[PDB]
Amino acid sequence: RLESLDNPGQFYQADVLTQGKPVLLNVWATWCPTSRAEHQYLNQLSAQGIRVVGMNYKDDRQKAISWLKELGNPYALSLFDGDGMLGLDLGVYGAPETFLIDGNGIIRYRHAGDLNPRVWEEEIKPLWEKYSKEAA
Amino acid sequence: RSQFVPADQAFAFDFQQNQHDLNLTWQIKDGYYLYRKQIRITPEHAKIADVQLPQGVWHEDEFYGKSEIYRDRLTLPVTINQASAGATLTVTYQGSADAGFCYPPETKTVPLSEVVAN
Ligand SMILES: [Cl-]
Ligand SMILES: [Cl-]
Ligand SMILES: [Cl-]
């Protein structure tokens, strides 16, 4: 149910999402200027070793692929939710959004709006350390 | 903890018809706006006059450019020349929040009361 963006008809097993460990899920869209605004910080954070899954939201694959090409692809797993069904059961209602999901696939935090140093180093990191540790 | 409210609260849609005259309305929460270019109105089993969208204000997105938007409230009259029984009007629109949030497009289906052509 986790459709690949770079490869249309490829699906991943739920396990692949977290692989028994915390992960960040970022909802983004080429039609959302705020997604562009938070992307570089996202590249960096993913550069620091934080695992982040990408979920292209009700967007155009060609544009989406092109987008990550010119701006960078900070996702270890890049997903496509054109119909917006996946976002619907995660409770996604717009972009940008960033979710913290623990090693067990449970949503531990949802943030609507741009992801930045402030939000991470003040709302997510502590929860990230907790669940990263809680994944002994 | 979210500062961005549900789509239907930021853009509260309503309509009122009186025979050939239909008025589409959106109450737009302060700090949010609709994109004039994303409004689409499609009749089903009805014939309407070309809809003129009103003059809105302007918004700029660093890399995307300038777009004509609507704030506070949007009033859109539509003329129903004819509508058969069970006719509908598909109304699609899209908006965002100034603080930085974009809602996906939303579609509402308006049941039109029957109107015989004049
Ligand atoms: Cl394809
Ligand atoms: Cl190319
Ligand atoms: Cl008809």
GROMACS .gro file of C-alpha atoms and ligand atoms in nm:
model
  257
    1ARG     CA    1   0.000   0.000   0.000
    2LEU     CA    2   0.319   0.207   0.009
    3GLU     CA    3   0.358   0.295  -0.359
    4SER     CA    4   0.698   0.407  -0.490
    5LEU     CA    5   0.731   0.751  -0.652
    6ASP     CA    6   1.044   0.687  -0.861
    7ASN     CA    7   0.895   0.357  -0.981
    8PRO     CA    8   0.518   0.372  -1.051
    9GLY     CA    9   0.408   0.011  -0.995
   10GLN     CA   10   0.636  -0.083  -0.703
   11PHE     CA   11   0.495  -0.137  -0.353
   12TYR     CA   12   0.678  -0.176  -0.023
   13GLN     CA   13   0.593  -0.388   0.279
   14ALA     CA   14   0.467  -0.192   0.579
   15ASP     CA   15   0.772  -0.319   0.766
   16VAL     CA   16   0.993  -0.117   0.533
   17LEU     CA   17   0.839   0.207   0.660
   18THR     CA   18   0.999   0.199   1.006
   19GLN     CA   19   1.199  -0.125   1.005
   20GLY     CA   20   1.166  -0.149   1.382
   21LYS     CA   21   1.282   0.203   1.458
   22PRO     CA   22   1.157   0.564   1.478
   23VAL     CA   23   1.106   0.755   1.156
   24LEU     CA   24   0.987   1.091   1.027
   25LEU     CA   25   0.713   1.101   0.760
   26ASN     CA   26   0.699   1.424   0.559
   27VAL     CA   27   0.396   1.519   0.347
   28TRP     CA   28   0.490   1.750   0.056
   29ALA     CA   29   0.354   1.875  -0.279
   30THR     CA   30   0.489   2.072  -0.574
   31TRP     CA   31   0.180   2.294  -0.553
   32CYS     CA   32   0.262   2.395  -0.194
   33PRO     CA   33   0.517   2.678  -0.173
   34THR     CA   34   0.566   2.606   0.196
   35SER     CA   35   0.694   2.257   0.104
   36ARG     CA   36   0.964   2.426  -0.101
   37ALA     CA   37   1.045   2.657   0.190
   38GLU     CA   38   1.112   2.371   0.435
   39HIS     CA   39   1.291   2.137   0.195
   40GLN     CA   40   1.650   2.247   0.251
   41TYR     CA   41   1.620   2.208   0.626
   42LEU     CA   42   1.480   1.864   0.553
   43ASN     CA   43   1.782   1.781   0.336
   44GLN     CA   44   2.013   1.874   0.622
   45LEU     CA   45   1.823   1.690   0.893
   46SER     CA   46   1.834   1.382   0.672
   47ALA     CA   47   2.204   1.459   0.632
   48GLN     CA   48   2.243   1.436   1.008
   49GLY     CA   49   2.126   1.076   0.985
   50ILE     CA   50   1.757   1.114   1.069
   51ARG     CA   51   1.552   0.866   0.864
   52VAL     CA   52   1.267   1.037   0.679
   53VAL     CA   53   1.002   0.889   0.452
   54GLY     CA   54   0.853   1.106   0.178
   55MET     CA   55   0.485   1.114   0.088
   56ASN     CA   56   0.403   1.312  -0.223
   57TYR     CA   57   0.050   1.444  -0.164
   58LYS     CA   58  -0.222   1.456  -0.436
   59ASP     CA   59   0.044   1.579  -0.679
   60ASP     CA   60   0.178   1.508  -1.032
   61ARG     CA   61   0.450   1.237  -1.039
   62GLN     CA   62   0.641   1.392  -1.325
   63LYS     CA   63   0.649   1.728  -1.146
   64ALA     CA   64   0.720   1.557  -0.814
   65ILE     CA   65   1.011   1.360  -0.952
   66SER     CA   66   1.147   1.668  -1.125
   67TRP     CA   67   1.110   1.860  -0.800
   68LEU     CA   68   1.326   1.623  -0.593
   69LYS     CA   69   1.579   1.625  -0.876
   70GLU     CA   70   1.641   2.000  -0.861
   71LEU     CA   71   1.596   2.031  -0.486
   72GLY     CA   72   1.741   1.703  -0.360
   73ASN     CA   73   1.584   1.381  -0.233
   74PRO     CA   74   1.620   1.357   0.147
   75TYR     CA   75   1.390   1.054   0.164
   76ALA     CA   76   1.512   0.699   0.231
   77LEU     CA   77   1.174   0.589   0.112
   78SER     CA   78   0.987   0.813  -0.135
   79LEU     CA   79   0.613   0.750  -0.160
   80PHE     CA   80   0.329   0.850  -0.389
   81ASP     CA   81  -0.026   0.915  -0.271
   82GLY     CA   82  -0.190   1.067  -0.578
   83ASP     CA   83  -0.540   0.966  -0.473
   84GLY     CA   84  -0.462   1.098  -0.126
   85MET     CA   85  -0.595   0.778   0.031
   86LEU     CA   86  -0.284   0.706   0.235
   87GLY     CA   87  -0.285   1.055   0.377
   88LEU     CA   88  -0.653   1.012   0.459
   89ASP     CA   89  -0.597   0.727   0.706
   90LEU     CA   90  -0.295   0.899   0.860
   91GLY     CA   91  -0.518   1.201   0.912
   92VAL     CA   92  -0.328   1.422   0.666
   93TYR     CA   93  -0.530   1.731   0.563
   94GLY     CA   94  -0.277   1.951   0.384
   95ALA     CA   95   0.094   2.022   0.341
   96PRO     CA   96   0.335   2.057   0.475
   97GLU     CA   97   0.304   1.807   0.760
   98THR     CA   98   0.562   1.601   0.948
   99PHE     CA   99   0.483   1.298   1.162
  100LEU     CA  100   0.693   1.110   1.413
  101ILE     CA  101   0.628   0.736   1.395
  102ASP     CA  102   0.801   0.504   1.643
  103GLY     CA  103   0.970   0.173   1.574
  104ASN     CA  104   0.633   0.004   1.615
  105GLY     CA  105   0.454   0.205   1.348
  106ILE     CA  106   0.260   0.419   1.594
  107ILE     CA  107   0.218   0.790   1.524
  108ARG     CA  108   0.377   0.972   1.817
  109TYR     CA  109   0.347   1.328   1.689
  110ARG     CA  110   0.187   1.527   1.407
  111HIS     CA  111   0.296   1.876   1.306
  112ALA     CA  112   0.108   2.078   1.044
  113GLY     CA  113   0.321   2.352   0.895
  114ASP     CA  114   0.686   2.390   0.800
  115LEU     CA  115   0.951   2.181   0.971
  116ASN     CA  116   1.237   2.394   1.101
  117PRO     CA  117   1.516   2.394   1.365
  118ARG     CA  118   1.275   2.535   1.623
  119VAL     CA  119   1.004   2.270   1.576
  120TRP     CA  120   1.251   1.980   1.571
  121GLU     CA  121   1.480   2.093   1.853
  122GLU     CA  122   1.177   2.175   2.066
  123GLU     CA  123   0.888   1.942   1.981
  124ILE     CA  124   1.023   1.640   1.793
  125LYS     CA  125   1.381   1.569   1.900
  126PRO     CA  126   1.292   1.490   2.262
  127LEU     CA  127   1.020   1.252   2.142
  128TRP     CA  128   1.268   1.120   1.886
  129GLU     CA  129   1.528   1.041   2.151
  130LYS     CA  130   1.264   0.881   2.372
  131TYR     CA  131   1.141   0.643   2.103
  132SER     CA  132   1.488   0.587   1.959
  133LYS     CA  133   1.600   0.474   2.305
  134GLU     CA  134   1.269   0.296   2.361
  135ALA     CA  135   1.377   0.090   2.061
  136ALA     CA  136   1.660  -0.086   2.245
  137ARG     CA  137  -0.177   2.212   1.890
  138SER     CA  138  -0.222   2.287   1.520
  139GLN     CA  139  -0.267   2.651   1.421
  140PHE     CA  140  -0.425   2.541   1.091
  141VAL     CA  141  -0.794   2.462   1.119
  142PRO     CA  142  -0.995   2.204   0.920
  143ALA     CA  143  -1.064   2.303   0.560
  144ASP     CA  144  -1.441   2.351   0.614
  145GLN     CA  145  -1.379   2.594   0.901
  146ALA     CA  146  -1.129   2.808   0.710
  147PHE     CA  147  -1.344   2.812   0.397
  148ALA     CA  148  -1.709   2.779   0.504
  149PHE     CA  149  -1.914   2.719   0.189
  150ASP     CA  150  -2.287   2.780   0.141
  151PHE     CA  151  -2.536   2.846  -0.139
  152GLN     CA  152  -2.886   2.979  -0.193
  153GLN     CA  153  -3.098   2.948  -0.505
  154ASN     CA  154  -3.412   3.136  -0.601
  155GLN     CA  155  -3.520   3.008  -0.939
  156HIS     CA  156  -3.279   3.137  -1.205
  157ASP     CA  157  -3.055   3.306  -0.951
  158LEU     CA  158  -2.798   3.117  -0.751
  159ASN     CA  159  -2.546   3.262  -0.509
  160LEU     CA  160  -2.237   3.068  -0.400
  161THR     CA  161  -2.067   3.190  -0.086
  162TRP     CA  162  -1.755   3.121   0.118
  163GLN     CA  163  -1.679   3.275   0.458
  164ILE     CA  164  -1.297   3.290   0.460
  165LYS     CA  165  -1.133   3.287   0.802
  166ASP     CA  166  -0.892   3.570   0.875
  167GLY     CA  167  -0.542   3.460   0.779
  168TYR     CA  168  -0.655   3.229   0.497
  169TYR     CA  169  -0.732   3.285   0.128
  170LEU     CA  170  -0.872   3.118  -0.184
  171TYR     CA  171  -0.690   3.107  -0.518
  172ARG     CA  172  -0.903   3.271  -0.786
  173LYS     CA  173  -0.742   3.048  -1.049
  174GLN     CA  174  -0.842   2.726  -0.871
  175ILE     CA  175  -1.219   2.783  -0.878
  176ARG     CA  176  -1.404   2.552  -1.120
  177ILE     CA  177  -1.782   2.536  -1.159
  178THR     CA  178  -1.944   2.260  -1.359
  179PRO     CA  179  -2.313   2.201  -1.417
  180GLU     CA  180  -2.467   1.854  -1.449
  181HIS     CA  181  -2.805   1.844  -1.628
  182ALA     CA  182  -2.826   2.224  -1.617
  183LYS     CA  183  -2.731   2.518  -1.834
  184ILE     CA  184  -2.567   2.820  -1.670
  185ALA     CA  185  -2.440   3.157  -1.794
  186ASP     CA  186  -2.063   3.205  -1.810
  187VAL     CA  187  -1.954   3.289  -1.457
  188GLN     CA  188  -1.752   3.608  -1.404
  189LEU     CA  189  -1.513   3.570  -1.108
  190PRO     CA  190  -1.480   3.900  -0.917
  191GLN     CA  191  -1.163   4.109  -0.881
  192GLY     CA  192  -0.970   3.988  -0.575
  193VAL     CA  193  -0.648   4.102  -0.408
  194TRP     CA  194  -0.290   3.991  -0.476
  195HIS     CA  195  -0.045   3.753  -0.312
  196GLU     CA  196   0.320   3.677  -0.384
  197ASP     CA  197   0.510   3.350  -0.327
  198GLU     CA  198   0.887   3.411  -0.344
  199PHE     CA  199   0.952   3.141  -0.606
  200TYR     CA  200   0.601   3.088  -0.748
  201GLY     CA  201   0.511   3.445  -0.836
  202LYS     CA  202   0.198   3.654  -0.789
  203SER     CA  203  -0.153   3.507  -0.775
  204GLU     CA  204  -0.497   3.667  -0.747
  205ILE     CA  205  -0.661   3.562  -0.420
  206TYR     CA  206  -0.977   3.620  -0.214
  207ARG     CA  207  -0.998   3.701   0.157
  208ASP     CA  208  -1.279   3.754   0.411
  209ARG     CA  209  -1.563   3.629   0.197
  210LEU     CA  210  -1.631   3.543  -0.167
  211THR     CA  211  -1.976   3.595  -0.321
  212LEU     CA  212  -2.031   3.440  -0.661
  213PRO     CA  213  -2.360   3.478  -0.847
  214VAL     CA  214  -2.452   3.217  -1.104
  215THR     CA  215  -2.735   3.236  -1.349
  216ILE     CA  216  -2.928   2.913  -1.398
  217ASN     CA  217  -3.082   2.937  -1.746
  218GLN     CA  218  -3.221   2.584  -1.709
  219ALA     CA  219  -3.195   2.291  -1.470
  220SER     CA  220  -3.370   1.955  -1.493
  221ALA     CA  221  -3.491   1.762  -1.186
  222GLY     CA  222  -3.195   1.634  -0.983
  223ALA     CA  223  -2.951   1.871  -1.162
  224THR     CA  224  -2.633   1.958  -0.974
  225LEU     CA  225  -2.349   2.206  -0.976
  226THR     CA  226  -1.998   2.083  -0.905
  227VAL     CA  227  -1.796   2.357  -0.734
  228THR     CA  228  -1.425   2.306  -0.681
  229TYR     CA  229  -1.187   2.548  -0.503
  230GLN     CA  230  -0.854   2.568  -0.317
  231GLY     CA  231  -0.694   2.783  -0.052
  232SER     CA  232  -0.402   2.821   0.189
  233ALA     CA  233  -0.304   2.979   0.521
  234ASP     CA  234  -0.078   3.287   0.541
  235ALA     CA  235   0.124   3.136   0.828
  236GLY     CA  236   0.224   2.862   0.585
  237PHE     CA  237  -0.012   2.575   0.504
  238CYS     CA  238  -0.174   2.461   0.181
  239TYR     CA  239  -0.502   2.279   0.166
  240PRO     CA  240  -0.574   2.039  -0.117
  241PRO     CA  241  -0.856   2.121  -0.361
  242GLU     CA  242  -1.206   2.057  -0.226
  243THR     CA  243  -1.523   1.980  -0.420
  244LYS     CA  244  -1.883   2.048  -0.314
  245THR     CA  245  -2.192   1.925  -0.497
  246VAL     CA  246  -2.484   2.165  -0.503
  247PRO     CA  247  -2.827   2.016  -0.566
  248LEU     CA  248  -3.003   2.258  -0.802
  249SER     CA  249  -3.379   2.306  -0.770
  250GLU     CA  250  -3.551   2.252  -1.105
  251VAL     CA  251  -3.574   2.548  -1.342
  252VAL     CA  252  -3.760   2.548  -1.674
  253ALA     CA  253  -3.594   2.750  -1.950
  254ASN     CA  254  -3.739   3.096  -2.013
  255CL      CL  255   0.397   0.517  -1.514
  256CL      CL  256   1.559   1.567  -1.690
  257CL      CL  257  -3.078   1.765  -1.853
   0.00000   0.00000   0.00000
